[PDB]
Design a protein around this ligand. Structure first.
Ligand SMILES: [Cu+]
Ligand code: NA
Length: 639
């Protein structure tokens, strides 16, 4: 089950309208309080007018709406279940504007919801674009609208939340499909649950930012339940999903052909591990005691070319273990991994001890010192985040987390780690004065301007519980070493939530839950539009356009020449990301030093060190003097 973010509005005075309503299934059957009566569009003798079908409500008075619920027919029949849909809010009953929520509701008889930022309105319109099985009907047993306690208009210059993307599953794991710009999401064997899985099946869901369509597909060809996996985009552009519910499986996702291909089994069964792409395109992983057993699981490396997993026993997991009260089950989880120079992988945390992992021979591990600062040694930060915002200067920003996986207080701790050559103890300092809000289970993404967007989480880690939630996201600005609070959202994003940077420079944040009958399952996501896509007036700014690219596939050290429609001041490459359980080892940013060829023509060189410029798919972004970024041009980097 799920839940609305506000309280139900009294449906007494209400006035309802429908496009079609067969006698006996009146428009008002939907707001009568009886779950055995339902509105139903024309059918049979009145014909079967196919969808879309519209349900409009005049609440008579103005209410601070923040959500709605739709209850399907409970008589045992499937006819009328809504699939694709949109939710509009109006003040006048003519001008509906943009949809506050849209997506696709799962095919079943459970109550569906649409939760979105509070917006005062008098009318509510639920459009049923499609029917869960392709039939011509729309039948709503009970429909409700919700209101928040009060309305506070967003503050100017602090970004905006919305719209809401309704999903058929709980996106506990996601990635951007680089060749198509689609958001791939997956839950487990069930749409809202992982517990009690027979293995070999994964429900996936996609969202196309261009078209706004939510489409789900069931994957069984890789015989893999991809819940709690390791995720890495290899040197060949394929996404490498490892272990989880099916602890030894490896599933590969090819963006080009939009298909899943079976991969070789890992040497050691794992779950909740972290995998990181190396400078040569291979994939390194270590830890992961959530599944496949609880014992010392050392590093191993996957080769895209030979399609093999090779064990690296001497790349010891031991030195990176936290002091979790639940022991090894949690202590080797979600390592903060970063692919670096000469096949090395840097482990920044969550453990206090940081280390260097080597992939030559049978592997090796070398101590890199402790995450610290003048404020002292930093404690184990399980489920804290790590983001490489300037790979060129080996800059990593770390923050949040707690001593233990759960029943542990979050910290406001934040550090700036500065990598050098593999083997040398990197420099670390405190980041400003830490986070505004202590949080764990939160998520982050590096933005085009190098700033890091931090959102969601709770003050105290309690999986599946929406307590002590932080609704105010923060953004760190490296040039000022300052954190800035942004406009708050209304949906709790804790355990099992994700965040990804979209090709358009906006943030996709969603999920949380995945606990079956719990009321904390969030089958949605929202879009955050940073202040950089707005001008002084609060309007959407004109974005520079990348009119030409000399090539879209470049070797490390190679050069690219572009043409824009206006003069650009800054440019940056951002590696496509994947996300789950606060881990994202794929995203990273590269600040570009531009050469002005004149006439709005520019050139730049991709870093020759593939350890900085990891192979795979990247996003090219250009910014004008105003700071407004263009949409991204996809560049494939190869070694
Ligand atoms: Cu999990
Ligand atoms: Na009813």
């Amino acid at each position: 089950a799920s839940a609305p973010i506000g309280s139900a509005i009294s449906r007494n005075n209400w006035a309802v309208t429908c496009d079609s309503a067969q006698s006996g299934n009146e428009c008002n059957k939907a707001i009568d309080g009886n779950k055995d009566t339902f509105w139903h569009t024309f059918y049979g003798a009145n014909g079967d007018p196919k969808p879309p079908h519209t349900y409009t409500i005049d609440m008579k008075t103005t209410q601070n709406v923040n959500g709605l619920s739709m209850l399907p027919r409970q008589d045992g029949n499937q006819n009328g279940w809504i699939g694709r849909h949109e939710v509009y809010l109006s003040s006048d009953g003519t001008n509906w504007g943009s949809p506050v929520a849209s997506g696709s509701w799962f095919a079943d008889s459970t109550t569906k919801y649409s939760n979105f930022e509070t917006r005062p309105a008098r009318y509510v319109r639920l459009v049923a674009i499609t029917e869960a099985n392709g039939q011509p009907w729309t039948s709503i047993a009970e429909i409700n609208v919700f209101q928040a306690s009060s309305y506070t208009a967003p503050q100017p210059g602090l970004g905006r939340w919305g719209p809401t993307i309704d999903l058929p599953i709980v996106p506990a794991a996601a990635a951007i499909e680089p060749t198509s710009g689609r958001v791939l999401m997956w839950s487990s064997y069930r749409n809202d649950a992982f517990g009690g899985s027979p293995g070999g099946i994964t429900l996936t869901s996609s969202w196309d930012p261009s078209t706004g369509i939510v489409s789900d597909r069931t994957v069984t060809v890789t015989k893999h339940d991809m819940f709690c996996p390791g995720i890495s985009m290899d040197g060949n552009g394929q996404i490498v999903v490892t272990g989880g519910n099916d602890a030894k499986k490896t599933s590969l996702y090819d963006s080009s052909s939009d298909s899943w291909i079976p991969g070789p089994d890992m040497q050691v069964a794992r779950g909740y591990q972290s995998s990181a792409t190396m400078s040569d395109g291979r994939v390194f992983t270590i830890g992961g005691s959530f599944s496949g057993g609880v014992f010392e699981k050392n590093g191993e490396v996957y080769s895209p070319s030979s399609k093999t997993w090779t064990s690296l026993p001497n790349a010891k997991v031991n030195p990176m273990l936290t002091a979790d009260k639940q022991g090894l089950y949690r202590s080797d989880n979600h390592a903060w991994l970063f692919g670096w120079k000469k096949g090395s992988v840097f482990q920044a945390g969550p453990s206090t001890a940081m280390n260097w992992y080597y992939t030559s021979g049978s592997g090796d591990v070398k101590s890199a010192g402790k995450r610290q600062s003048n404020r002292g040694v930093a404690p184990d930060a399980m489920c804290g985040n790590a983001v490489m915002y300037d790979a060129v200067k080996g800059k990593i920003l770390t923050f949040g987390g707690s001593p233990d996986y759960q029943d542990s207080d979050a910290t406001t701790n934040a550090h700036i780690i500065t990598l050098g050559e593999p083997g040398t103890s990197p420099n670390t300092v405190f980041a400003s004065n830490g986070l505004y809000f202590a949080r764990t289970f939160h998520t982050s993404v590096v933005l085009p301007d190098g700033s890091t967007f931090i959102t969601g989480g709770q003050r105290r880690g309690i999986p599946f519980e929406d307590s002590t939630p932080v609704f105010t996201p923060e953004i760190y600005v490296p040039e000022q070493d300052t954190f800035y609070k942004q406009n708050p959202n209304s949906i709790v994003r804790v355990y099992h939530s994700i965040s990804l940077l979209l090709p358009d420079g906006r943030v996709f944040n969603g999920g949380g839950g995945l606990c079956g009958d719990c009321t904390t399952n969030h089958f949605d996501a929202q879009i955050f539009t940073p202040n950089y896509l707005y001008n002084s007036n609060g309007n959407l700014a004109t974005r520079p356009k990348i009119t030409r690219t000399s090539t879209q596939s470049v070797k490390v050290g190679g050069r690219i020449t572009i043409s824009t429609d206006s003069s650009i001041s800054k440019a940056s490459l951002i590696r496509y990301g994947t996300a789950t359980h606060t881990v994202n080892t794929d995203q990273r940013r590269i600040p570009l030093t531009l050469t002005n060829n004149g006439g709005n023509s520019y050139s730049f060189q991709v870093p020759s060190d593939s350890g900085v410029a990891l192979p795979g798919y990247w996003m090219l972004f250009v910014m004008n003097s105003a700071g407004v970024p263009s949409v991204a041009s996809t560049i494939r980097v190869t070694q």
